[PDB]
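Saturday, quiet lab. Running sequence design on the structure tokens for the scaffold JK sent over.
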């Protein structure tokens, strides 16, 4: 499949809104599923710095290609305006959207 450019008011339920450049300074992408390695996504590769996770949701980003690197979970909404500490802003790696549910 592929990601869908053009976000809405606010992402929720396993929904995450990416934003080229940090501090939402650039186009915005809407992903309500899974998106690893965004090099050939048609307008997205490299452009990945500020992101916003919806509430009642759990976004897990995996530093480096989703195949290797590291993984982290983010319950409830969240605002990652900058990802330089994660791995140089822009070109994050992979982002997954999963709601909270019994183990």
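Result came back. Writing it out in full:
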């Amino acid at each position: 499949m592929s990601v869908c450019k053009g976000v809405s008011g606010n992402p929720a339920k396993g929904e995450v809104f990416l934003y080229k450049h940090v501090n939402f300074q650039g186009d915005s992408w809407k992903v309500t599923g899974n998106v690893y390695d965004f090099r050939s996504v048609s307008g997205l590769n490299d452009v990945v710095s500020s992101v916003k996770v919806g509430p009642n949701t759990k976004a897990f980003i995996f530093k480096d290609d989703r195949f290797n690197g590291n993984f982290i979970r983010l319950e409830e909404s969240s605002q990652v305006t900058d990802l330089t500490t994660r791995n140089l802003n822009d070109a994050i790696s992979s982002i997954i959207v999963a709601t909270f549910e019994s183990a």
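Notes for JK: Residues 1-103 form a domain with the Gamma-B Crystallin; domain 1 fold (CATH 2.60.20.10). Helices lie at 84-87. Ask whether to fix the surface positions before the next round.
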